[PDB]
Design a protein around this ligand. Sequence first.
Ligand SMILES: [Mg+2]
Length: 195
Amino acid sequence: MSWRHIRAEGLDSSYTVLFGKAEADEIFQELEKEVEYFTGALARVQVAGKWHSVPRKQATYGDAGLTYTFSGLTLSPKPWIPVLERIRDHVSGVTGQTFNFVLINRYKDGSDHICEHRDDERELASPIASVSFGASRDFVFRHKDSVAVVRLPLAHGSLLMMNHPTNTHWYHSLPVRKKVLAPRVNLTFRKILLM
DNA sequence: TCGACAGTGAGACA
DNA sequence: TGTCTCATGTCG
Ligand SMILES: [Mg+2]
């Protein structure tokens, strides 16, 4: 495939268009039809005097028997459904990697956003693979000591690999974009350690 | 608790 | 003067 390499001090990501327009549209429609997001009616849960939040407005799928941590709670993801395995397999076919877990987030319009953050490394092996469908949304990298800014529209059917050491030295965000009126779905594939 | 996003002020430009 | 973008406070 044709890769754009995103290079800077401590930043190594790469970007390509994984699915052409027609196939991206079909997968997008199937994602909207099939993915089941936690609603967040239930907001938190307490054990031994400590509250723990519960994931809202996202969906997790992964291999049978796998568990992952979220705010101190160990959870099991939903078993793979066919469209996710399809996407997972295209990502693998184009990188030589395997993934056992995916986090799906939905951004209904430009006002849904994500504030500057670094992914939890505690449970990861590995490159993080992020696949987008729907409206194009700007994704931005900033350095944890600032140093330059890198901005990338994540287009319909694209794959962004965040390779080591991107996630240690740079924080990422998906900022508000008022003029975007249409939804975006993002899939973040990982390999969860069995250790 | 502490993660998601509400709230806010400064600065741009329309 | 109004709306947007960028970069601490709250609460379930
Ligand atoms: Mg992230």
